[PDB]
Amino acid sequence: SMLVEIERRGDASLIVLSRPEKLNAINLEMLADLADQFSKAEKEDTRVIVITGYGKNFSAGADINMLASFDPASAYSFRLKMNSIAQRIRKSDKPVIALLKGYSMGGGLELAESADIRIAMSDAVIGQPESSIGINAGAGGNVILPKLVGRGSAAYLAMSGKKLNAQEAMALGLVDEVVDDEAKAWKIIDDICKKPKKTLQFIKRAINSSYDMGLESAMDQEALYFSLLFTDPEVLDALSKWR
Template sequence: MGWQTLELRIEQSLATITLNRPKALNAINLAMVGELEQVVRQVRDDPDVRVVVITGAGEKAFAAGADITEFKAMSPIDAWMFVQRLQRLFLEIERLPKPVIAAVNGYALGGGCELMMACDIAYAADTAMIGQPEINLGIIPGAGGTQRLARLIGKQRAKALVLTGEMIGAQEAWGLGLLNKVVPADHLMVEVRKLAGKLAGNAPVAVKAAKEAIEDGYDMALERALAHEAQLFALCFATEDKTEGVNAFLEKRPPMFKGK
């Protein structure tokens, strides 16, 4: 399928989604939202894909936010419908049963920062800039920027970033807990692919269960979350991959997981 605002490349078990509006700093417009909805479902349903990477085209931006030119004509109802759609999309990314890596190659602002936070792991170039600058437009973040940000770095730090609208560098973002790793810009995709290869070698059912345990359990009371974890732990024991993993360990060989 021909995409207008993004590119999808599938190599063996790795799917790379590239936001492809470099002249607009990969700003997220309505067309991109529609195409992302389709491509996210495509990689979700592809049994050969075990890891997903999201990055931006060019060297300047991962995604510099929503396309502000589309905001000008939006009514409050239009804005509410748009941001709810964006929230659903980012939730779908967050809940993919496969690891999702953000390869932040430049500006990750507004909706771009919100997309980054919906991913499981975020690697960034040392030149990347992160922020939620919506306050400078007289609005607030609407696709997770007030919610995921506070959950990731705490309320006080989140309020400072949102209320000032300031951008921060990759190293500072790493120090706050927004990024997992900062690497030289020309090594970003090398490091991301190295991580993707490691994740792709893990048992798919266990990966899905681990994501579910962490995501669902985070907002549960501890006792209930532990019970949920125990159920998922036991579920893994019903898989062929568990048998393969244990046998491989005892036989001192690499496991060959099949996702069963």
């Protein structure tokens, strides 16, 4: 019935893009399902949210037959929906971790760019090829990408549509760790789950908001967050051995 599944592994909610017969390409139905499952994942008592694809591939990008059906109005409406999910990923109290494999491209990869962390399987094919069919970006491929890789790499990747392997994407900053085995990805995710929730939440907020202000203001904010952590029971317990 559903093009996005929600599952559970330990302390992680696991969201799975499930349309493998079309390389998990994102259409309107998938987008609506992704928003619904992402809500469910946020309300659960899990500590992180992991996003991946079903089968061999993460996602080949936006559905091209859908793209080809758009006029300006319906295109704008599609992008508002993309933006909204990307924003919910960025504003989430929980860390969001994308697990990339096989095809990881375009609009799908761009949603992963809003995630906190990207881990790639060694077989991953990563890139933003949609300029070839006249599209600028699915969801941050022009305005979030450069914060990950720099101004020059962002333009190059978006204009050329170059496909990267996993090590090349890591060396640019587009991916944070490469693993040859799924268990090793879960080990990294599980280690993140050990950290206090409020701590991760504040780390995430300060990182995000660093892009919207000058340094001093950002440092002021980071200090205030640090201070509020001392009202949190989980943080105080994590420190109690040294009390």
